[PDB]
Design an enzyme around this catalytic site. Structure first.
Site, PDB file in Angstrom:
ATOM      1  N   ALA A 139       0.555   3.985   1.367  1.00  0.00           N
ATOM      2  CA  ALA A 139       0.708   4.593   2.677  1.00  0.00           C
ATOM      3  C   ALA A 139       1.999   4.152   3.382  1.00  0.00           C
ATOM      4  O   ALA A 139       2.569   4.906   4.179  1.00  0.00           O
ATOM      5  CB  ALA A 139      -0.505   4.292   3.558  1.00  0.00           C
ATOM      6  N   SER A 140       2.452   2.923   3.104  1.00  0.00           N
ATOM      7  CA  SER A 140       3.590   2.345   3.827  1.00  0.00           C
ATOM      8  C   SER A 140       4.898   2.995   3.346  1.00  0.00           C
ATOM      9  O   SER A 140       5.215   2.920   2.157  1.00  0.00           O
ATOM     10  CB  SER A 140       3.671   0.798   3.664  1.00  0.00           C
ATOM     11  OG  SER A 140       2.398   0.262   4.072  1.00  0.00           O
ATOM     12  N   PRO A 141       5.676   3.599   4.267  1.00  0.00           N
ATOM     13  CA  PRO A 141       6.940   4.212   3.824  1.00  0.00           C
ATOM     14  C   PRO A 141       7.847   3.316   2.974  1.00  0.00           C
ATOM     15  O   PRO A 141       8.296   3.732   1.896  1.00  0.00           O
ATOM     16  CB  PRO A 141       7.604   4.672   5.124  1.00  0.00           C
ATOM     17  CG  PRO A 141       6.455   4.860   6.080  1.00  0.00           C
ATOM     18  CD  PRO A 141       5.391   3.872   5.695  1.00  0.00           C
ATOM     19  N   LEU A 195       0.870  -1.166   0.000  1.00  0.00           N
ATOM     20  CA  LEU A 195       0.000   0.000   0.000  1.00  0.00           C
ATOM     21  C   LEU A 195       0.897   1.202   0.000  1.00  0.00           C
ATOM     22  O   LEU A 195       1.920   1.216   0.710  1.00  0.00           O
ATOM     23  CB  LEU A 195      -0.936   0.064   1.222  1.00  0.00           C
ATOM     24  CG  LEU A 195      -2.369   0.283   0.703  1.00  0.00           C
ATOM     25  CD1 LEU A 195      -2.904  -0.784  -0.240  1.00  0.00           C
ATOM     26  CD2 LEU A 195      -3.275   0.378   1.926  1.00  0.00           C
ATOM     27  N   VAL A 252       7.158   0.951   1.037  1.00  0.00           N
ATOM     28  CA  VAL A 252       6.574   0.765  -0.279  1.00  0.00           C
ATOM     29  C   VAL A 252       6.883   1.967  -1.163  1.00  0.00           C
ATOM     30  O   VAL A 252       7.254   1.813  -2.340  1.00  0.00           O
ATOM     31  CB  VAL A 252       5.063   0.477  -0.201  1.00  0.00           C
ATOM     32  CG1 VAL A 252       4.438   0.420  -1.594  1.00  0.00           C
ATOM     33  CG2 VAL A 252       4.838  -0.832   0.541  1.00  0.00           C
TER      34      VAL A 252
END
Ligand SMILES: N[C@@H](CCC(=O)N[C@@H](CS(=O)O)C(=O)NCC(=O)O)C(=O)O
Ligand SMILES: N[C@@H](CCC(=O)N[C@@H](CS(=O)O)C(=O)NCC(=O)O)C(=O)O
Lengths: 223, 221
Positions: free
Chosen positions: B9-11, B7, B13
């Protein structure tokens, strides 16, 4: 080419990761003690070499490299007769790099230093349950990672084995690895213990670390 | 071709999104929302027993940990080594900065807060967790020194990794741009990249939105 210099103390897990690597590579070096417990890492001369003030730090001909993972990758890449301990094959390297990064975060930062920092900072609170859980989480993942293989990143010894054993051997002071629950970890530890240089490079310092930690009267909270 | 699971949102990523955009390598993105525990499907556990995002599939192989992924991506697809220099001394700086991000930044400063926060545990965050963020800023300011980028004067995967988490730590503790002028200037430099907002900015905003669902404060010592 001047001989390499390793800064640190044997008790420190990431220093032992580098000692293991240097032994495996049969690369001569000087060991210079930097006692972090006496804040010798805050000497202005040491800060010039490593502004993060961590051990291990390595000198190679006037260049200073730190972080055990960066160091041991560099050492193999520079001095390994072959790439056996840190394969150049990109997929194999990606497993080894994942395991090294796992050790940096999930193991050293989240499971070990999260305990040792407040402990050395004089806290007598009783170690929170979350810190116990963080160690068990490491063992549970490592047992999975070792499925179907003799080493942590595949079928050959690599710097990932050295990095992870350095901290696992020290986490045992807080929570012994149950050899019945974790037969793969137990077998892997025994395999690495047969390396001729294991006790000099890691075992002795692991024991010194254990003795240091057993000076403190720590307990884990039940909740 | 490539599949990225995660996602935005995940740093970590976002560190991969940044790298893929810089390399101009096309990819399929598959949503795996860890906040909704989608990472515990039997299908995802088979791909990654650590059940973390990001996970990358390339030609049927599963690779995880953003730092392993982004190194692999530059090594495989980079037309030059600019983003991950092959020079062993320059690589040792980049690898140190990557490992710094794994441990001192992501594990010690960010996830140490978000795990209990998102689990509904603590609203009052221990002061040590504030200190951990300030320590990141102090070190990063020192690392930047006079250079435009974190590992030297060229953009590397270390910049992508570190901005991914620093952009999210600001939700908890804003970077004082007077105190940290080098961080401030480095942030602006990266924001100018044409792919910055798609690769990092959007996810940083989503992550911030998650965090602001909670009424967090910091404890004193
Ligand atoms: N993940 C890094 C850990 C370095 C570190 O924190 N080392 C400790 C000694 S051990 O514990 C250290 O140098 N602590 C002193 C300080 O951080 O000021 C690595 O692999 O080199
Ligand atoms: N340092 C690693 C962090 C991976 C991670 O924990 N990712 C989180 C999402 S963010 O927060 C994650 O996957 N959490 C779910 C889980 O750990 O089960 C990396 O670089 O890939």
């Amino acid at each position: 080419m001047p001989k390499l210099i390793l800064y640190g103390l044997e008790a420190s897990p990431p220093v032992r990761a580098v000692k293991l690597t240097l032994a495996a590579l049969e690369v001569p070096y000087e060991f210079v003690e930097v006692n972090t417990r006496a804040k010798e890492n805050f000497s202005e001369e040491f800060l010039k070499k490593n502004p993060q003030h961590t051990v291990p730090t390595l000198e190679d001909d006037g260049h200073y490299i730190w972080d055990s993972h960066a160091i041991i990758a560099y050492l193999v890449s520079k001095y390994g007769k072959t790439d056996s301990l840190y394969p150049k094959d990109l997929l194999q390297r990606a497993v080894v790099d994942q395991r090294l990064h796992f050790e940096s975060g999930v193991i050293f930062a989240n499971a070990l230093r999260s305990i040792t920092k407040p402990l050395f900072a004089g806290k007598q609170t009783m170690i929170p349950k979350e810190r116990y859980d963080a160690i068990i989480e490491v063992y549970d993942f490592l047992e999975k990672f070792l499925a179907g293989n003799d080493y942590v990143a595949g079928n050959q010894l690599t710097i990932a084995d050295f990095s992870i054993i350095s901290t696992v051997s020290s986490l045992e002071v807080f929570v012994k690895v149950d050899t019945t629950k974790y037969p793969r970890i137990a077998a892997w530890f025994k395999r690495l213990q047969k390396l001729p240089y294991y006790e000099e490079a890691n075992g002795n310092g692991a024991r010194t670390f254990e003795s240091f930690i057993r000076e403190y009267n720590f307990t884990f909270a039940s909740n």
